[PDB]
Amino acid sequence: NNNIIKFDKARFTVLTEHLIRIEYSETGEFEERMTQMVQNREFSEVNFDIIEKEETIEIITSTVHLYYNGGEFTNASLFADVKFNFSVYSNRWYFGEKSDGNLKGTTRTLDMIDGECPLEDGIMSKNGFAVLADKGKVLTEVGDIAGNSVSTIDLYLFAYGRDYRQALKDFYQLTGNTPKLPRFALGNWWSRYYDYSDKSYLALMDKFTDKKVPLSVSVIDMDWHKVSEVPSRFGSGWTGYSWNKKLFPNPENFIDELHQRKLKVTLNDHPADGIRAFEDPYPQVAQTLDLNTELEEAAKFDFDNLKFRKAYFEEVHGPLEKEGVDFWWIDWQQGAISKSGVDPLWLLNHYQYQNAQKKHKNNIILSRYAGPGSHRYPLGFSGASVISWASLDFQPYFTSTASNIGYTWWSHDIGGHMQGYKDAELSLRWLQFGVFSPINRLHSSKSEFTSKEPWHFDAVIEQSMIDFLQLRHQLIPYLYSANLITASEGRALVEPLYYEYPMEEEAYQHRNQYLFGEQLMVAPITEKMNSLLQMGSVEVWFPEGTWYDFFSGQPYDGKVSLKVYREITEMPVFAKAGAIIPLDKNPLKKEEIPSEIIWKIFPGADGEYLLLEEDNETKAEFVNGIFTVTSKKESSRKHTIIYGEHEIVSAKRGEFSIDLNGKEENFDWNFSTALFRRLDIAEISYEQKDEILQQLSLIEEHEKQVAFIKTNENQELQNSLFELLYSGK
Amino acid sequence: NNNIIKFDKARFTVLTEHLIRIEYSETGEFEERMTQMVQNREFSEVNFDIIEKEETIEIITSTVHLYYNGGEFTNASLFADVKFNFSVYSNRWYFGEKSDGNLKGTTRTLDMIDGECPLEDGIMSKNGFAVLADKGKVLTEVGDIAGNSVSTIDLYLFAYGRDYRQALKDFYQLTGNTPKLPRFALGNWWSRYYDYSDKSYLALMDKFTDKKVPLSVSVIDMDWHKVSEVPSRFGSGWTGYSWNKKLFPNPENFIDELHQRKLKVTLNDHPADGIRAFEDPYPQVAQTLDLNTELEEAAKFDFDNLKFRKAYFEEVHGPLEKEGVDFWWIDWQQGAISKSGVDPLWLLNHYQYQNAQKKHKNNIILSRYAGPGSHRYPLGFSGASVISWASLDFQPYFTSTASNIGYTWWSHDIGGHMQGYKDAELSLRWLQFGVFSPINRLHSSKSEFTSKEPWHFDAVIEQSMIDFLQLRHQLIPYLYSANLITASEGRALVEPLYYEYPMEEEAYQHRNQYLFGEQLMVAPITEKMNSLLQMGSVEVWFPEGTWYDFFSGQPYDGKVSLKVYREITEMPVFAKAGAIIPLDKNPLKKEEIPSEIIWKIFPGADGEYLLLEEDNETKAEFVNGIFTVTSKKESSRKHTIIYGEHEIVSAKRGEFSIDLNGKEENFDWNFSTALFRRLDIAEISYEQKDEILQQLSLIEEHEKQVAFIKTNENQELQNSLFELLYSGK
Numbered sequence A, B: 001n002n003n004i005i006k007f008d009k010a011r012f013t014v015l016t017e018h019l020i021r022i023e024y025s026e027t028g029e030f031e032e033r034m035t036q037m038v039q040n041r042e043f044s045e046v047n048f049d050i051i052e053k054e055e056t057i058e059i060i061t062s063t064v065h066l067y068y069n070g071g072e073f074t075n076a077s078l079f080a081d082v083k084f085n086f087s088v089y090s091n092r093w094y095f096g097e098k099s100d101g102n103l104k105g106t107t108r109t110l111d112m113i114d115g116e117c118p119l120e121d122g123i124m125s126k127n128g129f130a131v132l133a134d135k136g137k138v139l140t141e142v143g144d145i146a147g148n149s150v151s152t153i154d155l156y157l158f159a160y161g162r163d164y165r166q167a168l169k170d171f172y173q174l175t176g177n178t179p180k181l182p183r184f185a186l187g188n189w190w191s192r193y194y195d196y197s198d199k200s201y202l203a204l205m206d207k208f209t210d211k212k213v214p215l216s217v218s219v220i221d222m223d224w225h226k227v228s229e230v231p232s233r234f235g236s237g238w239t240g241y242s243w244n245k246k247l248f249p250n251p252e253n254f255i256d257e258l259h260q261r262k263l264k265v266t267l268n269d270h271p272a273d274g275i276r277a278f279e280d281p282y283p284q285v286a287q288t289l290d291l292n293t294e295l296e297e298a299a300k301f302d303f304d305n306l307k308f309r310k311a312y313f314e315e316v317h318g319p320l321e322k323e324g325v326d327f328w329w330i331d332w333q334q335g336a337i338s339k340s341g342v343d344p345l346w347l348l349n350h351y352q353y354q355n356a357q358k359k360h361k362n363n364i365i366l367s368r369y370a371g372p373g374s375h376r377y378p379l380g381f382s383g384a385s386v387i388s389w390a391s392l393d394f395q396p397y398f399t400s401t402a403s404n405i406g407y408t409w410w411s412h413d414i415g416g417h418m419q420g421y422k423d424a425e426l427s428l429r430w431l432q433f434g435v436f437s438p439i440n441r442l443h444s445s446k447s448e449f450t451s452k453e454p455w456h457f458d459a460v461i462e463q464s465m466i467d468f469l470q471l472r473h474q475l476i477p478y479l480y481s482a483n484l485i486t487a488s489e490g491r492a493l494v495e496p497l498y499y500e501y502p503m504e505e506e507a508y509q510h511r512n513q514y515l516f517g518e519q520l521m522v523a524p525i526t527e528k529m530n531s532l533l534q535m536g537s538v539e540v541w542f543p544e545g546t547w548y549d550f551f552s553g554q555p556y557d558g559k560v561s562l563k564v565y566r567e568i569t570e571m572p573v574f575a576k577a578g579a580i581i582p583l584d585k586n587p588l589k590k591e592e593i594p595s596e597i598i599w600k601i602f603p604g605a606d607g608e609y610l611l612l613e614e615d616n617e618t619k620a621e622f623v624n625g626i627f628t629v630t631s632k633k634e635s636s637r638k639h640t641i642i643y644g645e646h647e648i649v650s651a652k653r654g655e656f657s658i659d660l661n662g663k664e665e666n667f668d669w670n671f672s673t674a675l676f677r678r679l680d681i682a683e684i685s686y687e688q689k690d691e692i693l694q695q696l697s698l699i700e701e702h703e704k705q706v707a708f709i710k711t712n713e714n715q716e717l718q719n720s721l722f723e724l725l726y727s728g729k
């Protein structure tokens, strides 16, 4: 109440020094209930100043002057000056107007998108302020829609400057934290829009095992249910709740077989045509909803309706869950229309996520983005992207930017969904990105030609895809720990560079570069390789410090912007001196938590990593060359230590300390080996290869080696050779 | 009343199983009067089902579920599911929203359009439903504007699936059938924006006769009236009702001369500046309308005003009609503004078409499209197209698509109106299309360089244009019979392929291909010829069956999509085995109905043709090789029979039967002659011509002749040779 100020028909709540709620009420009553967006307005007390006159009020915090001159809210009556100098004259908010600087957020879907699409604003701005309008309905205490707010205007002014992480934390305090994901969500998912039988689906799952590809999730797409068998008088077979008995004669037994293989099972649900008279559950639903069965009255989709929702969860989903379905893929594409004015997609995500908690702890959905606050209902499902280099090139930027509206669990169709064109290299680059994305779900539309099975491709592509898919399971400990940090501390797994480096202009100029947890920096390659080099490339910004390629140990002295080149089988991922990354030593081994962890240490600085698990916390410390591992609880877990290049300790039990000061710090990576490899794969003249190898071996002074490559007629070859020289300086 | 259901403030009329009127009234009174669009709501009783509850109503027909949940009509309150599966999730109509699938209709005009323009929706959809909003004013019983409907929302839900012909028939039952055209409308029209005198206009008409070009209509454009002679204080000379006496010293005598030549006469009327004080009829109009003549008060155009309309028809048009003007070219381009909110173009077409019936039976106008229902006022006048290949390439698609809103008598300026560029081949291809279009009106803007006279061009173009212009008059019996079928059965002369072949995807992929009556399929060439081939081309979809080129007898086995090549003098027109096409044997002969008919029979199947005339019906039957001609009434008419290639019977009177089983079925058309001609005109190397002729003569097996042409370095030459091989298979 000390942090609440009324003036004329407005109410101002100073939630933090940098977050002010702004309300208008014609009725003099202001809204206390939660909304679709807002779950909590309880914040600790803060200091601020007021200048209140007859006709005007000014609220003053450490970061903003908010002015209200009375009357209806207009661009003239309600406005704010930030106490920052990030811009020369973009430091003022005017009610109902847009200002420059917004770093954007996300959008509902990538359905039908070939490359870039427009995004909605987020809460982050380079100029230090953003306004988030609450246009949603009020909730009841139990979380049903209650109707219109009595605050007919309800806004949140964010004035955090470039303290982006704190803005996001306080956003999560206002809108509710992201829930914890279950560990199974972080493994590889198999999905394909393909009319598998029980037999061919299990045969494929057993082929994954034979091929050494680990999976956590078995998606079954819409051909699980009747499609062509639906009489046309009912409409299409898009919506379905009845097994196709030719393909799945015993569904519970088939799901039992996936459960024996330690897979979680989800089915595609297209809800929009509801429960029509041909469906297996229709007799029960018709009885519950008092439908006219002799006129074959449909139970039309109506998620505003309590009785419909109950029948949907209990009598439609319920029997399928009893057969063993673990969680729901809500695949909604039929618009934003409802009686209530609430988006049916929001109603589905809110009510289905809540219903999923009844049968499994920390359960998920898979569904499209439903607006600010819908991060409460993971996972995000971006949908039917066009298969193209342009779509891949948009996706890292899309994924990191989404953290700016707190939606940090986007699952993209890895390799793209539909249409587009075949290029095995595009498929491989997309999988590299997916492995370093929130969720790694392989999926494809209905084409005989778009399977994401590694063995679809040639032996080189296949082996690389298998390697990356195994790496995803090696990363599950790191991902799961980051997941618990999202849930408990409001930190995104994927951060734009500018979260960590807000004052570095280069942190705003590398759209596809991101931080992946706290220990890794990713620069995916999203452009087709230069055939003369047989290598793809990306311009990488290296912050201040010593950086190592995560895979090769190639070093880079920051701060620098440097074009980096990789073969199609290799991905630019970097770790700082002192980085500690845990890996599952046994990624193929079915076990709910790893029996063995590899501690991968990057020499040259102190470091620390906290491994959060379901029932433990394990701290790895690297201080003055001493590596120490301690846990809250004891276990039989065996620890492996890799210090730079070399395995130091193999499968050691319990807590321990070891001195690595007397151990080889340097990786093997060396200029001459790397130079020989780049020249050898290049589709260039042998006389050019001979001369470059000879001259770069003979010329001793680094500045003269660089002068020699500066004369090369191949401009991209110059850049590739320059990367090696820079790493070898 | 059994087919009428009221619920809340709505009224639902089930007109057919597939056509439901949807009304809202705030006052509880619903509209029974006709509207600008709707002339008849009397339909035979149909069966349907209702589910009526406290708060909701569902109407169920064989093809649609219409739902209304009460309150104001919104996208949430009023919606419909079709009982079809043409799409996966585009089977629902939402009030006020657009869905995918609409096959489009037409637009007001092609004025100033170079190629394509956007079209309005029609009543046809690939997904099986369309909504046609009635936003017009109510009429009185006699057909004057009465003001606003009491049904403040008035919609027609069409749910015909892909039964397009039935949708159009029922549209014509709702909006009124197209009236019969007079036979004279179906012949060639001469028009040119050029300042002819009486003498030079008659000299040109006599030159047409000398050149063996038949004409039905003599258009006189705006230089008939005063133009430069109008004092500038009155504004421009665009509007005029006073003969230029230098050019037309005795108008009645000049119109008498056109009447002696068996021409119908129309004048251009630009109505928008009304009757100003310099006009010949102004003294009479001023007296009737009580104008201030000493202040030279204009009788401004006001078609909302009963007295203005009367003075316009009786005192302005009346004297010109007494001089012999047969019908009015209404040339309105001055906007959609009126006191009433009724488009002045609609007021002109409605009232002028009605007034034209006073002096001639089945009279016409010539005017732009005035919205749904304005098919009641033929003919359509598309206006000032840009002269270009792009404009020609749009026009067949434009013409057939218009049938989807029932506007089936579009008259285009043949050869294009204005601007654009000279290409004698474009002029010739445009005339080919015009001859197989609803109306063949040659017209051109004010340029010394754009006359459509055949003898404007070189001897090759001239002779081809004369041949096509004579063909149009040969087709008048077929056109006039189709005209009576439009008027009596609601079948368009020009149909998109998908009317006949709604389930064939290829019927939606050949935009410029159409059915022309029931016996002919047209694929106009609308792209400049390939100079290497000296031939133009179009990809033709041949439906199942045996097809013949109408002109050459070249055969084609359906179903196939095949690129076809024609010299600039030849047009792709096709007839099925069993086709019977009547032709006027004496197209140059002035006679109100043909004294001789050629029955052109395509061998290989049974067929039938009904020739409807002013005062007769003649049935031609081809059954098990027996051709029979019978008529309702006897006449002196002499019948000629052409069976494939050969004239069997010459000028035989009365009813008769003849056996053609013992007569040569095969056309002369042959691979070797056609191959020699294509190679001979081609601007390619003689060594290539020599080798193709030699190899295609020597190689006996059809598959190896195709393999030989597959090696040709000229890709289009491959396609041309492949067409011949396919026809010769």
Ligand SMILES: *[C@]1(O[C@@H]2[C@@H](O)[C@@H](O)O[C@H](CO)[C@H]2O)O[C@H](CO)[C@@H](O)[C@H](O[C@H]2O[C@H](CO)[C@@H](O)[C@H](O)[C@H]2O)[C@H]1O
Binding pocket: A112, A192, A193, A221, A222, A268, A331, A333, A383, A384, A418, A444, A445, A446, A447, B088
């Ligand atoms: C894609 O699906 C279409 C189907 O609609 C149908 O036409 O069959 C086609 C194959 O011949 C198939 O390509 O396109 C639609 C329209 O854009 C999408 O809605 C589909 O994506 C969604 O549904 C899929 C099936 O459940 C699912 O795998 C996707 O993840 C969904 O986004 C798309 O596959």
Ligand SMILES: *[C@]1(O[C@@H]2[C@@H](O)[C@@H](O)O[C@H](CO)[C@H]2O)O[C@H](CO)[C@@H](O)[C@H](O[C@H]2O[C@H](CO)[C@@H](O)[C@H](O)[C@H]2O)[C@H]1O
Binding pocket: B112, B192, B193, B221, B222, B268, B331, B333, B383, B384, B418, B444, B445, B446, B447
């Ligand atoms: C064309 O007419 C213009 C005239 O407006 C005037 O400027 O003289 C020009 C020649 O030097 C002439 O080209 O352009 C206008 C504006 O777009 C159209 O309205 C004219 O078309 C209509 O009027 C014509 C004359 O009656 C008629 O032949 C057309 O059929 C009408 O559409 C167009 O000719």
